[PDB]
Write an enzyme that holds these catalytic residues in place. Structure first.
Site, mmCIF file in Angstrom:
data_model
loop_
_atom_site.group_PDB
_atom_site.id
_atom_site.type_symbol
_atom_site.label_atom_id
_atom_site.label_comp_id
_atom_site.label_asym_id
_atom_site.label_seq_id
_atom_site.Cartn_x
_atom_site.Cartn_y
_atom_site.Cartn_z
ATOM 1 N N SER A 116 -19.847 68.102 -27.163
ATOM 2 C CA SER A 116 -21.200 68.631 -27.418
ATOM 3 C C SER A 116 -21.636 68.318 -28.858
ATOM 4 O O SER A 116 -20.809 68.573 -29.784
ATOM 5 C CB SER A 116 -21.272 70.095 -27.163
ATOM 6 O OG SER A 116 -22.518 70.641 -27.596
ATOM 7 N N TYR A 140 -28.446 65.631 -28.125
ATOM 8 C CA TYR A 140 -29.855 65.943 -27.835
ATOM 9 C C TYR A 140 -30.682 64.919 -28.614
ATOM 10 O O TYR A 140 -30.224 64.569 -29.713
ATOM 11 C CB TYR A 140 -30.123 67.393 -28.243
ATOM 12 C CG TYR A 140 -29.403 68.428 -27.414
ATOM 13 C CD1 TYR A 140 -29.694 68.528 -26.073
ATOM 14 C CD2 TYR A 140 -28.412 69.268 -27.916
ATOM 15 C CE1 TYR A 140 -29.077 69.462 -25.274
ATOM 16 C CE2 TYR A 140 -27.776 70.212 -27.123
ATOM 17 C CZ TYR A 140 -28.130 70.314 -25.790
ATOM 18 O OH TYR A 140 -27.607 71.188 -24.883
ATOM 19 N N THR A 166 -28.445 64.571 -22.946
ATOM 20 C CA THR A 166 -28.867 65.779 -22.206
ATOM 21 C C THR A 166 -30.361 65.933 -22.392
ATOM 22 O O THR A 166 -30.797 66.163 -23.523
ATOM 23 C CB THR A 166 -28.102 67.008 -22.651
ATOM 24 O OG1 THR A 166 -26.718 66.766 -22.447
ATOM 25 C CG2 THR A 166 -28.499 68.217 -21.836
ATOM 26 N N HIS A 259 -27.425 72.209 -15.829
ATOM 27 C CA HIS A 259 -26.943 72.871 -17.068
ATOM 28 C C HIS A 259 -26.310 74.205 -16.697
ATOM 29 O O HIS A 259 -26.454 75.187 -17.439
ATOM 30 C CB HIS A 259 -28.120 73.044 -18.039
ATOM 31 C CG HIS A 259 -27.821 73.054 -19.505
ATOM 32 N ND1 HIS A 259 -28.273 72.062 -20.323
ATOM 33 C CD2 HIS A 259 -27.176 73.946 -20.301
ATOM 34 C CE1 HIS A 259 -27.896 72.308 -21.585
ATOM 35 N NE2 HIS A 259 -27.228 73.442 -21.605
HETATM 36 C C1 LIG Z 1 -21.510 78.189 -22.537
HETATM 37 C C2 LIG Z 1 -22.164 76.882 -22.162
HETATM 38 C C3 LIG Z 1 -22.685 76.037 -23.124
HETATM 39 C C4 LIG Z 1 -23.220 74.780 -22.783
HETATM 40 N N1 LIG Z 1 -23.645 73.931 -23.779
HETATM 41 C C5 LIG Z 1 -24.011 72.713 -23.418
HETATM 42 C C6 LIG Z 1 -24.258 71.747 -24.389
HETATM 43 O O1 LIG Z 1 -24.023 71.918 -25.610
HETATM 44 N N2 LIG Z 1 -24.545 70.482 -23.991
HETATM 45 C C7 LIG Z 1 -24.776 70.151 -22.678
HETATM 46 O O2 LIG Z 1 -25.096 68.991 -22.406
HETATM 47 N N3 LIG Z 1 -24.608 71.086 -21.721
HETATM 48 C C8 LIG Z 1 -24.181 72.279 -22.064
HETATM 49 N N4 LIG Z 1 -23.873 73.199 -21.088
HETATM 50 C C9 LIG Z 1 -23.932 72.757 -19.678
HETATM 51 C C10 LIG Z 1 -22.624 72.074 -19.221
HETATM 52 O O3 LIG Z 1 -22.498 70.723 -19.711
HETATM 53 C C11 LIG Z 1 -22.472 72.041 -17.699
HETATM 54 O O4 LIG Z 1 -23.663 71.367 -17.168
HETATM 55 C C12 LIG Z 1 -22.294 73.398 -17.032
HETATM 56 O O5 LIG Z 1 -21.263 74.138 -17.713
HETATM 57 C C13 LIG Z 1 -21.930 73.264 -15.566
HETATM 58 O O6 LIG Z 1 -22.070 74.511 -14.865
HETATM 59 P P1 LIG Z 1 -20.734 75.406 -14.557
HETATM 60 O O7 LIG Z 1 -19.932 75.498 -15.906
HETATM 61 O O8 LIG Z 1 -21.287 76.733 -14.096
HETATM 62 O O9 LIG Z 1 -20.000 74.663 -13.460
HETATM 63 C C14 LIG Z 1 -23.309 74.428 -21.427
HETATM 64 C C15 LIG Z 1 -22.836 75.322 -20.465
HETATM 65 C C16 LIG Z 1 -22.201 76.485 -20.808
HETATM 66 C C17 LIG Z 1 -21.628 77.366 -19.720
#
Ligand SMILES: Cc1cc2nc3c(=O)[nH]c(=O)nc-3n(C[C@H](O)[C@H](O)[C@H](O)COP(=O)(O)O)c2cc1C
Ligand SMILES: Cc1cc2nc3c(=O)[nH]c(=O)nc-3n(C[C@H](O)[C@H](O)[C@H](O)COP(=O)(O)O)c2cc1C
Lengths: 368, 368
Positions: A116, A140, A166, A259
């Site tokens: 990330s 981003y 993203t 997401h």
């Molecule tokens: C706590 C948290 C923080 C996240 N931060 C980011 C991020 O920094 N960048 C990003 O592309 N997606 C982010 N996501 C989305 C994840 O890449 C991913 O799409 C998501 O965790 C999938 O859903 P699931 O964990 O419920 O299976 C985040 C998700 C969570 C749970």
């Protein structure tokens, strides 16, 4: 002022759902709810989970299969199982070893770590955990073009072999838990150190998503692809027209995701969007699928439906929510074993065989 | 005994349908009807043609496209357009230069030549027409394993880079034209002569097919792939389960075909079977599609529906009849130019863009 868990141990994972309740009796309320929560009343997070009951697996008999092989290849990496680590911000909310802890699990297991832009760990901390393991960098779009050149250069110097753009986060989702909790990120983002101008602690959640580029266009996909000389995934895709646009704009992969339901509310469960995207992509580029993968059966259903691999999120982080704690290498090992069972029972000797499974259409949905 | 046309000339191709009637004026009656005819009353040949009206192309506007590129790659061969030559027996029924004439057209155009096991030309004569151009060998399996090893070794020594196992002809179709005309081949077939004991000359196709293997099993796909060390296509697939089976038994490609409606009667038009097969293959191996391709729109619709390339048959042979290698070449050039128009009007800059097209479902079928 943030007392994350610090204990290191293996966990006997029965299922990943129980990992959520496990952890909250040191495991700070605001950070737990930041990790676990989703937009609105979380109906779309529930949809991500219930979508797996829309298409059901058939057991298949006398298939001449034993000791299924979970290994696969994506963009020149052979990986132990067809799952990778999703890019997630701020792993320090779950554990003191933060992204370095996750990276060590991912690398020791034998798959790809997605880093990330909003990591709380320095790259040198993440690199120490990775110990040469493969890594993809998630960005981003910045409003400032120089910031985009600088972060793509950083990722490439840091050994990234793909960029994940993203695009579904141009503003924040309506994350009611974070609002009700008045949640503030307790630490910095030592990679995006080039944007927030003032302070990082003095910005809650609305002002940081605001800080990045809102007016992303196909030209941004073209320019990331051209500058990086790395394959670019576009992440957050739920509509097939965006997949066609992204490929025509030079994307090297499609990352189907909502997401984790943390962005647009009152949208479909992510798995329900996958077949229409896969049919439109029609093999042109690899597909990564995420948002709700909790079981081996989910990995199999995604592959049967056109994904090349899935990405894992919340279950791997579960170093936190509700009870007493669990989530790490044990979780990756659980998913590999869980998938191996499903492969044996569906007649699948290898990951390519999973891609040929027919699924049972359940029109009754979750209550049956 | 058989006075095939011998003139060599370019032809101005307005459409490939008009080539059939034109070829009927110069090709002797028996041989013409062997090429043109199909099983029963030819309802499934008509279905092959009418199936293209089931899924209609959309014109697309302001797509920022100019000078579409028809090139593509299959199994490490860069080819000028996403079509290859289908394996067709006995080209000497159409023209005195026989398979060497077809080979010269295909190699001059820049695509792959498929060599029928029932060629009237030797590997040497075809090699001279190809002048180094890529070739795939289509096997009609002998019942004798050693004859299969010999045929496969000869083809690979001649430069084959893939094997096509045609599995849909274990007995002849009910070809009423050939029954009514008492059609027999007027010349020998040098590649398969070894298992005909006598000569293909004066033999019915019933008796030639009858000499080849009936009891083809998955083991045959395994054994051809093991012995040749070349990618094996399984040709004649119309049911998705045969695609899954062929891939699990070691095929490197699926060749969706009903043999130009010359085999099973009262079966679907080939194009109607393609989507279900492509969804089951799910990118595991390349797909070749044939049986009824007559226009650039058909090439586009096949790619949009999961085929990597199509194979051309009857129209090329009719071109050969009318102009030898230059006539056959004229037909390949027609298809390339026809596809280029369709790419411009559909907003397709390249062959990958064609794979991403949505088609309009026409539930009224041909009469609309
Ligand atoms: C706590 C948290 C923080 C996240 N931060 C980011 C991020 O920094 N960048 C990003 O592309 N997606 C982010 N996501 C989305 C994840 O890449 C991913 O799409 C998501 O965790 C999938 O859903 P699931 O964990 O419920 O299976 C985040 C998700 C969570 C749970
Ligand atoms: C005259 C003729 C002879 C054929 N002989 C063979 C053959 O030797 N081997 C084979 O695999 N298919 C054979 N086929 C089938 C073709 O490979 C192909 O599937 C067919 O020509 C496609 O239909 P279309 O030409 O109507 O588009 C033959 C077809 C025709 C028209």
């Amino acid at each position: 002022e943030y007392n994350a868990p610090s204990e290191i141990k293996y966990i006997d994972v029965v299922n990943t759902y129980d990992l959520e309740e496990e952890a909250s009796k040191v495991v700070p309320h605001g950070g737990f709810n930041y990790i676990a929560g989703a937009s609105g009343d979380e109906w779309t997070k529930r949809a991500n989970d219930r979508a797996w009951k829309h298409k059901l697996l058939y057991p298949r008999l006398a298939q001449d299969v034993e000791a299924p092989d979970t290994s696969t290849e994506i963009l020149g990496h052979k990986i132990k199982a067809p799952f990778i680590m999703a890019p997630i911000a701020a792993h320090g909310l779950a554990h003191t070893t933060k992204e370095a802890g996750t990276a060590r699990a991912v690398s020791e297991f034998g798959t790809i770590m997605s880093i990330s832009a909003y990591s709380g760990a320095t790259f040198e901390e993440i690199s120490e955990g990775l110990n040469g393991g493969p890594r993809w960098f998630q960005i981003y779009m910045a409003k400032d073009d120089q910031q985009n050149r600088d972060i793509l250069d950083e990722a490439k110097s840091d050994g990234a072999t793909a960029i994940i753009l993203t695009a579904d986060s141009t503003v924040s989702g309506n994350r009611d838990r974070d609002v009700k909790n008045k949640f503030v990120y307790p630490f910095g983002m030592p990679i995006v150190q080039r944007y927030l101008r003032g302070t990082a602690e003095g910005m809650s959640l609305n002002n940081i998503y605001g800080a990045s580029k809102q007016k992303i266009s196909p030209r941004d996909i073209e320019e990331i692809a051209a500058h990086s000389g790395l394959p670019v995934f576009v992440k957050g895709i739920q509509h097939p027209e965006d997949a066609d646009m992204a490929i025509k704009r030079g994307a090297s992969g499609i990352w189907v995701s909502n997401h984790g339901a943390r962005q647009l509310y009152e949208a479909p469960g992510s798995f329900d969007t996958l077949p229409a995207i896969a049919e439109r992509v029609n093999k042109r580029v690899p597909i990564v699928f995420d948002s709700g993968v909790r079981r081996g059966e989910h990995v199999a259903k995604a592959l049967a439906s056109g994904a090349d691999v899935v990405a894992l999120g919340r279950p791997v982080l579960f170093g936190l929510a509700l009870g007493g704690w669990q989530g790490a290498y044990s979780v990756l090992d659980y998913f590999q074993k869980d998938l191996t069972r499903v492969m044996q029972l569906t007649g699948s000797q290898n990951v390519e065989d999973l891609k040929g499974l027919d699924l049972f259409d359940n029109p009754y949905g979750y209550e049956y």
